[PDB]
Design a protein around this ligand. Structure first.
Ligand SMILES: *[C@@H]1O[C@H](CO)[C@@H](O[C@@H]2O[C@H](CO)[C@@H](O[C@@H]3O[C@H](CO[C@H]4O[C@H](CO)[C@@H](O)[C@H](O)[C@@H]4O)[C@@H](O)[C@H](O[C@H]4O[C@H](CO)[C@@H](O)[C@H](O)[C@@H]4O)[C@@H]3O)[C@H](O)[C@H]2NC(C)=O)[C@H](O)[C@H]1NC(C)=O
Ligand SMILES: *[C@@H]1O[C@H](CO)[C@@H](O[C@@H]2O[C@H](CO)[C@@H](O)[C@H](O)[C@H]2NC(C)=O)[C@H](O)[C@H]1NC(C)=O
Ligand SMILES: *[C@@H]1O[C@H](CO)[C@@H](O[C@@H]2O[C@H](CO)[C@@H](O)[C@H](O)[C@H]2NC(C)=O)[C@H](O)[C@H]1NC(C)=O
Ligand SMILES: *[C@@H]1O[C@H](CO)[C@@H](O[C@@H]2O[C@H](CO)[C@@H](O)[C@H](O)[C@H]2NC(C)=O)[C@H](O)[C@H]1NC(C)=O
Ligand SMILES: *[C@@H]1O[C@H](CO)[C@@H](O[C@@H]2O[C@H](CO)[C@@H](O)[C@H](O)[C@H]2NC(C)=O)[C@H](O)[C@H]1NC(C)=O
Ligand SMILES: *[C@@H]1O[C@H](CO)[C@@H](O[C@@H]2O[C@H](CO)[C@@H](O)[C@H](O)[C@H]2NC(C)=O)[C@H](O)[C@H]1NC(C)=O
Ligand SMILES: *[C@@H]1O[C@H](CO)[C@@H](O[C@@H]2O[C@H](CO)[C@@H](O)[C@H](O)[C@H]2NC(C)=O)[C@H](O)[C@H]1NC(C)=O
Ligand SMILES: *[C@@H]1O[C@H](CO)[C@@H](O)[C@H](O)[C@H]1NC(C)=O
Ligand SMILES: *[C@@H]1O[C@H](CO)[C@@H](O)[C@H](O)[C@H]1NC(C)=O
Ligand SMILES: *[C@@H]1O[C@H](CO)[C@@H](O)[C@H](O)[C@H]1NC(C)=O
Ligand SMILES: *[C@@H]1O[C@H](CO)[C@@H](O)[C@H](O)[C@H]1NC(C)=O
Ligand SMILES: *[C@@H]1O[C@H](CO)[C@@H](O)[C@H](O)[C@H]1NC(C)=O
Ligand SMILES: *[C@@H]1O[C@H](CO)[C@@H](O)[C@H](O)[C@H]1NC(C)=O
Ligand SMILES: *[C@@H]1O[C@H](CO)[C@@H](O)[C@H](O)[C@H]1NC(C)=O
Lengths: 134, 97, 121, 436, 134, 134
C-alpha cells in the first residue's frame, strides 16, 4: 500500500513506486465535491483540492524539464560528482532506506536539479535538433 | 372496479393466497390489524418496504394481483386490502384453523 | 419520529361540521403530501383527497366536492380536514396518510398512517 | 494476438450529474445594478453555440429524475435571497396601521415610523392593497411570522435568457424528437455546448414566456393515470395576453432610516380601475380544442374543466410578475366550458407583500411602479392536475401550480447532463515493441 | 465535433479522438475568471473549474502510469484474457459502438487497469533499467 | 532569468527556454495557501492559482495532442505552406526576435494549430497502429 515500503531497502522499494504515485492526486474516487446535499468545511476543502494539484503538477513539470515526463524511472547522462556522496553501489541500494538517503544529500539537491535541466535536456535538445537537420 | 374475495382458508405452514383484479391492480397491499390503522406490507406489487417480515411477498400477473404469504402465524389474523392508486378493494379476512 | 398523530374521536349531529386535524412531527412536513382516506366499518375504504402543505392545492372526489375543505397550519406542522353538510351516511374512521419512508416517488401507495379518528354521525 | 489498446478520447458517457453554470447572452447593457438572475457575475455565453447533431444512437431520458431542475430551482432561490440581502428591511413598518377605505381594493393606511433620528417620530400615510393587510387597527400580512425586506428599486425582475452550461469534461444531451414524451428513449439526440434561452419566470397554472412546440401539443406527466403529479400541457401555438394595471399610481418615499428608504404607494389620481388581462377569445377557443384532442388520446370519453378548488391565494389565481408588480389573475373564466374583439377579461388583484417559494424567511415587498403598467404574457404551456377517484364517464383537470420545479421542467425536458469518460480499453492486433 | 462519433463504428470513431481530447479542459477560450466585472455564480463556477482539472489530471495520470502519457493510442504487451470478452476482431471494431462496449466489461476494468500498471510498465521499467546497465 | 532573452535573436533565446518554462506554474515555492495564519485577499489568491493551473494545462495539452508532451523542442512532418510567411531561414533565426514573428503570423496560427493535430499526430498514430500490427 501507500508508503508501505518506507522502511524497506531501496531495491525492494523501487519495485512498488506506482502505489505511491497514484495517491498524490486522487482525490476524485473519494469525492467530487460532494453534491449530494447541496461553511468552514467548504472553503477548507477547496483549498486542499487546489493544493494537491499544485504539488502534483510541479513534479510532472520537473520530470518534464528533465525529459522524463512519461516514465517513473529514467536514466540520464549527467555524471555523479563524488562531492555529493562518497558511498558505493552496494552501500546504497541494498543496505539503506530512502528516508536516510534524503537526509544526507538534501543540502546540494538544488544544484543537482540544476544539473538535470541544464547539463542534459538543454544540451540534448539542441544536439537533437542539429542531428535531425539532415 | 377493484375487487377481491372476502375469506380464503389457511393453516400454519400453508400459504394464504388472494386474488385482486382490476385496472393497475395491486399497487399496494395493507394489513389492517383490528383496532388500529393499516400498514403497508408491499408496494409496486412486488417490492418490500422496511419494517415488515421476509415472508410477506407478492406476485404480479396481467390483471390479477396475487399476494402470497408463506408460514402463517396466529398473530397475522387481520384484514387485507388491495389498492390501485386512489381506488381500494373490498377486503379479505384471514382464516387460520 | 416520522409519525402522524390525529385528534380525538368526534360524534356530531347531521348538518354540523367536524374538524379532523393531523399534526406531523419528526420529518419534513412541507415536502410530503398529506392524503386523507376514509374507511366505513363494514365497507371498502374510500379515498377523500390529498393536500400538499406548500400552498395547499387541495384535490377532491365528487362524492365530497363542495362538502370538505382542507386547510393547514405549516408553522405548527398541522394538517386539517373539515367536513360540511354531514349526513347519515358519513360515518367512518378518518385516516391521514403520507409517503415518506419509501423509494417510490409515484405518490402511491401509503406507508405512514395516523392513530385514527372514528367519526359517527 | 489480442493485447489491450487504450484509447484516450473515446465517445462514451455515463449518467452522472455535476454543477451547472450560468452563461447569459452578450448583453452587458446594465447601467445600473440590475438583473437579479444574472446578478453581478454571470459570464457571457458563446456567440456561436456549437450545436452538434448526433445520429446512430438512441439514449433514454427522464425529465422527472433530472437533476438540472433541482439545481436550477436551488439557484433561483439562492439568487432571490442574495439580491434581497443588501436591500432595505421593513422591520420598523410592523406597527398598528390606521387604515380607511378609498371608496375598491386599496386601503389608505397611516402608520407610525421612526425617522433617521432615533427619538423623533413621524406620522405618514400610504396606500396598501387589501390582501397585504390582515386585521388585528391593522398590520401587515406577515409581520408576526418573519421579517420583510423590500425589493431594491434599482434592480429589475425582468427574466433575461440564461443558459445553464455544464463545465469542461461534461456534456448536455438535447433530444430532438418533435413529439417527445419525456420519460423514454429519444431516437434523435444532439450534444450541445449548453442550453437555449431560458427565461426564469415565476408563474402558476400558466407557463409564461417559454419554448413552443413544433408539430403539435404534447401532454406531459409522470404517469398521466396517476392523479398526484401535475400534467404539463406544452402548447404548440402561443396565445396573446395584454395584462395591465390601468390606474395611475404615484410612488411616495417614506423616510424610515439612514439610507433605508421605504417606497410606498402615494396618492392615486385618475380612475380607480381593476387590473385585467385579455387572453383573446378566438385563439384560446382553438387552443382548448387542440388540448382536448391530445387529452382524448390518453382517455376514451369526454373531459371537462373546472377552476381550482382551494389552497393559498397564489395558486388559486394565476400569479406572475408584470413590470415589477405581482399579479393574481382569476382564471375561472378560462377553464369554465365542459368539452369532450370580444375578449375574455380576467380580474387581477395586485399584492405587494409577496412570500415566494413559501420558505420561512424573507418575504419581499415589491415597491410600486410610477404610472401605468403593461406587459406581454405569452403562454407556452399549462399546468393541470387530474381529479380523484371517479366514474369513467368524465374527468376533470383542475389547474394548479405545485412546486416550482414544474416550471423549469417545461424548459429542461430536452436536456440531460452526462459525464465524459475519455478512457477506454478495447483489444486490437497491435503490440508495442518488446523490451528484449 | 465533440462526441460526434458516439454512434459510429469503432473504426470510424477512432479517427477523430482528438476532438474529444481538446474539449475536456477548455475552459480558457470561454473565460478566464472573468476579470471584467470585479455571488452564488462565483462559488459555483470555481468548484467546476477545480473539478475539470482534477478529473482531467486523473486520466493523464493513468496514461502516465501505463507509459502512454504522450500518446492518444498506445499498444501494450499485456495479453487479453478471454474471460473478459469472447468477441473477435471483426465482431468488435466494424460492427459495434463504444457505448455498448463499456457496458459489458465494466465489471473487471479495475482489474484490467491493475494489469496495465503492474504487468507492463512496472515490469518494463525494471527490465529497461537492467537493459541500459551496459 | 525569466523572459530575459525577449529582445535577443531567436537562436540565442532558444537556448534558455527552460527558464521561462519553470515559472508558469510555481507557485508553490512562494506559497502553499499559506497555512501560517489560519478576506478579499483569500478569494483573490485562490482564483489566481486555479487560473495558473488551467492555462498551463492547456499548453501541455496542446503539446500532448501534437505528440510533443515530454519535449520542449519537437520537429514534425507537416510542411510549411509559404502563404503563412515568405521569409527564409537566415532572415528569421539570426536577425529577428520572437516578438515580431508572433505579430505577423498570429492570423493563421489557428489553422496551423489545426494542422499540427490533424496532419501528423492523427495520421502518425493510425499509421503506427498499422505498423506494429506485424
Ligand atoms: C414576457 O416577455 C415579454 C416580452 O415579449 C415581456 O414584456 C416586456 O417586459 C419588459 C419588462 O417588463 C418591458 O420592458 C420595459 O418597458 C418599460 C416601458 O417601455 C416604454 O417606456 C420606455 C421609457 O419611456 C420607452 O423607452 C419604451 O420604448 C416604451 O415606450 C420601460 O420603462 C422599462 O425600462 C426599464 O429600464 C429603464 C432603463 O434603466 C428604466 O428607466 C425603467 O424605469 C425600467 O426599469 C423596460 O424596458 C417591455 O416593454 C415588455 N414588452 C415588450 C414587447 O418587450 C413580459 O414582461 C414577460 N412576462 C413575464 C411574466 O416574464
Ligand atoms: C398461492 O401460492 C402458490 C404459489 O404462488 C400458488 O401456486 C401457483 O400460483 C399461481 C398464481 O398465484 C397460479 O397461477 C398457479 O396455478 C399456482 N399453482 C399451483 C400448483 O397451485 C397457489 O395457487 C396458492 N397456494 C395455495 C392455495 O396453497
Ligand atoms: C405508472 O406507474 C405504475 C406503477 O406505479 C406502472 O405500472 C407498471 O407498468 C409496468 C410496465 O410499464 C408493468 O410491467 C407493471 O406490471 C405495472 N404495475 C406495477 C405495479 O408495477 C405504469 O406503467 C406507470 N404508467 C406509465 C404510463 O408508465
Ligand atoms: C435530428 O435533430 C436535429 C436537430 O433538431 C436536426 O437537425 C436540424 O434540423 C433541420 C431539419 O433537418 C435542419 O434544417 C437543420 O439545419 C438541422 N441543423 C443542423 C445544424 O444541421 C436533424 O435533421 C434531425 N434528424 C432526424 C433524422 O430527425
Ligand atoms: C389618505 O389619508 C391621508 C391622511 O393624512 C390624507 O392626507 C391628507 O389629506 C387631507 C385631505 O383630507 C389633505 O388636506 C392633506 O394635505 C393630506 N396630507 C398629506 C401629507 O398628503 C390623504 O390625502 C389620503 N389619501 C387618499 C387617496 O385618500
Ligand atoms: C394584445 O396587444 C397586441 C398589441 O399590443 C394586439 O396585437 C395587435 O393588434 C392590432 C389590432 O388590434 C394589429 O393591428 C396589430 O398588427 C397586432 N400586433 C400583433 C403583434 O399581433 C392584440 O390584438 C392584443 N390582444 C388582445 C386580446 O387584446
Ligand atoms: C373567479 O371568478 C368567478 C366568477 O367569475 C368567481 O366564482 C363565483 O363568482 C360569483 C360572482 O359572480 C360569486 O357570487 C360566487 O361566490 C363565486 N363562487 C362560486 C363557487 O360560484 C370566483 O369566486 C372568482 N375567484 C375568486 C378567488 O374570487
Ligand atoms: C449511421 O448508420 C448508417 C446506417 O447503417 C451508417 O451507414 C452510417 O455510417 C452511420 N453513421 C453516420 C455518421 O451516419
Ligand atoms: C403615533 O404616535 C402618536 C404620538 O406620537 C400617537 O398619538 C398615535 O396613537 C400613534 N399611532 C397611530 C397614529 O397609529
Ligand atoms: C400572525 O397573525 C395572523 C393575523 O390573523 C394570525 O392569524 C396568525 O396566527 C399569526 N401567527 C402566529 C404564529 O401567531
Ligand atoms: C412516453 O412515450 C414513450 C413512447 O415510446 C413510451 O415508451 C413511454 O412509456 C411513455 N411514458 C409515459 C410516462 O407515458
Ligand atoms: C369555439 O369553437 C367552437 C367549435 O370550433 C364553436 O362552436 C364556438 O362558437 C367557438 N367560440 C367562439 C367564441 O368563437
Ligand atoms: C364560462 O365563463 C365565461 C366567462 O365569461 C362565460 O362567457 C361563459 O358563458 C361561461 N360558460 C358556461 C357554460 O358557464
Ligand atoms: C410571444 O408570442 C409571439 C406569437 O405571436 C411570438 O412571436 C413572440 O416571440 C413571443 N415572445 C417571446 C418573448 O417569446
Amino acid at each position: 500500500g501507500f508508503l508501505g515500503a518506507a522502511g524497506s531497502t531501496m531495491g525492494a522499494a523501487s519495485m512498488t513506486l506506482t502505489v505511491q504515485a497514484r495517491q498524490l492526486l486522487s482525490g476524485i474516487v473519494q469525492q467530487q465535491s460532494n453534491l449530494l446535499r447541496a461553511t468552514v468545511w467548504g472553503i477548507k476543502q477547496l483549498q486542499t483540492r487546489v493544493l494537491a494539484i499544485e504539488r502534483y503538477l510541479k513534479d510532472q513539470q520537473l520530470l518534464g524539464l528533465w525529459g522524463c515526463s512519461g516514465k517513473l524511472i529514467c536514466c540520464t547522462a549527467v555524471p555523479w560528482n563524488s562531492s555529493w556522496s562518497n558511498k558505493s553501489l552496494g552501500d546504497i541500494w541494498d543496505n539503506m532506506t530512502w528516508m536516510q538517503w534524503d537526509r544526507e544529500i538534501s543540502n546540494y539537491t538544488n544544484t543537482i536539479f540544476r544539473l538535470l535541466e541544464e547539463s542534459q535536456n538543454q544540451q540534448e535538445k539542441n544536439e537533437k535538433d542539429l542531428l535531425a537537420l539532415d | 372496479a377493484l375487487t377481491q374475495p372476502r375469506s380464503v382458508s389457511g393453516s400454519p405452514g400453508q400459504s394464504v393466497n388472494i386474488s385482486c383484479t382490476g385496472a393497475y391492480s395491486g399497487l399496494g397491499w395493507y394489513q389492517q390489524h383490528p383496532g388500529r390503522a393499516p400498514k403497508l406490507i408491499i408496494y409496486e406489487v412486488n417490492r418490500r418496504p422496511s419494517g415488515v417480515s421476509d415472508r410477506f411477498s407478492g406476485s404480479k400477473s396481467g390483471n390479477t394481483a396475487s399476494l402470497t404469504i408463506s408460514g402463517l402465524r396466529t398473530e397475522d389474523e387481520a384484514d387485507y386490502f388491495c389498492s390501485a392508486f386512489e381506488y381500494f378493494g373490498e377486503g379479505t379476512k384471514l382464516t387460520v384453523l | 419520529q416520522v409519525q402522524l398523530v390525529q385528534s380525538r374521536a368526534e360524534v356530531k349531529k347531521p348538518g354540523a361540521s367536524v374538524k379532523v386535524s393531523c399534526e406531523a412531527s419528526g420529518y419534513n412536513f412541507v415536502d410530503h403530501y398529506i392524503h386523507w382516506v376514509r374507511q366505513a366499518p363494514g365497507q371498502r375504504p374510500q379515498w377523500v383527497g390529498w393536500m400538499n402543505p406548500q400552498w395547499g392545492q387541495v384535490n377532491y372526489a365528487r362524492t365530497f366536492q363542495g362538502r370538505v375543505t382542507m386547510t393547514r397550519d405549516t408553522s405548527i406542522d398541522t394538517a386539517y380536514m373539515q367536513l360540511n353538510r354531514l349526513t347519515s351516511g358519513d360515518t367512518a374512521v378518518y385516516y391521514c396518510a403520507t409517503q415518506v419512508k419509501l423509494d417510490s416517488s409515484a405518490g402511491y401507495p401509503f406507508d405512514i398512517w395516523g392513530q385514527g379518528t372514528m367519526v359517527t354521525v | 494476438d489480442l493485447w489491450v489498446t487504450v484509447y484516450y478520447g473515446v465517445p462514451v458517457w455515463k449518467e452522472a450529474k455535476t454543477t451547472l453554470f450560468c452563461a447569459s447572452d452578450a448583453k452587458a447593457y446594465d447601467k445600473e445594478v440590475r438583473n437579479v438572475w444574472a446578478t453581478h457575475a454571470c459570464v457571457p455565453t458563446d456567440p456561436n453555440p456549437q450545436e452538434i447533431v448526433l445520429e446512430n444512437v438512441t439514449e433514454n431520458f427522464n425529465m422527472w429524475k433530472n437533476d438540472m431542475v433541482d439545481q436550477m430551482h436551488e439557484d433561483i432561490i439562492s439568487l432571490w435571497d442574495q439580491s434581497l440581502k443588501p436591500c432595505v428591511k421593513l422591520t420598523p413598518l410592523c406597527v398598528t396601521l390606521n387604515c380607511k377605505n378609498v371608496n375598491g381594493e386599496i386601503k389608505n393606511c397611516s402608520f407610525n415610523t421612526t425617522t433617521e433620528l432615533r427619538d423623533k417620530k413621524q406620522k405618514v400615510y400610504a396606500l396598501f392593497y387589501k390582501p397585504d393587510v390582515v386585521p388585528l387597527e391593522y398590520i401587515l400580512i406577515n409581520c408576526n411570522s418573519s421579517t420583510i425586506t423590500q425589493a431594491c428599486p434599482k434592480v429589475s425582475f425582468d427574466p433575461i435568457p440564461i443558459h445553464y452550461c455544464a463545465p469542461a469534461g461534461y456534456a448536455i444531451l438535447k433530444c430532438n424528437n418533435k413529439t417527445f414524451n419525456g420519460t423514454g428513449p429519444c431516437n434523435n439526440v444532439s450534444t450541445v455546448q449548453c442550453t437555449h434561452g431560458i427565461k426564469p419566470v415565476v408563474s402558476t397554472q400558466l407557463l409564461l414566456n417559454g419554448s413552443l412546440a413544433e408539430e403539435e401539443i404534447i401532454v406531459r406527466s409522470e404517469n398521466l393515470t396517476n392523479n398526484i403529479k401535475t400534467i404539463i400541457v406544452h402548447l404548440n401555438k402561443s396565445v396573446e395576453i395584454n395584462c395591465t394595471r390601468p390606474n395611475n399610481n404615484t410612488r411616495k418615499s417614506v423616510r424610515i432610516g439612514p439610507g433605508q428608504w421605504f417606497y410606498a404607494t402615494g396618492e392615486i389620481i385618475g380612475d380607480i380601475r381593476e387590473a385585467h388581462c385579455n387572453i383573446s377569445r378566438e385563439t384560446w377557443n382553438s387552443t382548448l380544442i387542440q388540448v382536448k384532442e391530445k387529452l382524448r388520446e390518453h382517455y376514451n370519453k369526454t373531459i371537462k374543466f373546472e377552476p381550482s378548488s382551494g389552497g393559498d391565494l397564489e395558486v388559486t389565481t394565476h400569479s406572475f410578475n408584470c413590470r415589477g408588480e405581482f399579479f393574481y389573475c382569476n382564471t375561472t373564466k378560462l377553464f369554465n366550458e365542459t368539452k369532450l374583439n370580444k375578449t375574455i377579461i380576467l380580474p387581477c388583484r395586485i399584492k405587494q407583500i409577496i412570500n415566494m417559494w413559501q420558505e420561512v424567511g424573507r418575504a419581499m415587498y415589491a415597491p410600486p411602479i410610477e404610472g401605468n403598467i403593461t406587459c406581454k404574457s405569452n403562454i407556452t404551456g399549462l399546468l393541470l392536475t387530474w381529479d380523484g377517484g371517479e366514474n369513467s364517464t368524465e374527468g376533470v383537470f383542475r389547474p394548479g401550480g405545485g412546486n416550482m420545479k414544474d416550471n423549469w421542467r417545461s424548459e429542461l425536458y430536452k436536456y440531460k447532463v452526462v459525464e465524459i469518460k475519455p478512457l477506454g480499453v478495447a483489444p486490437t492486433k497491435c503490440k508495442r515493441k518488446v523490451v528484449g
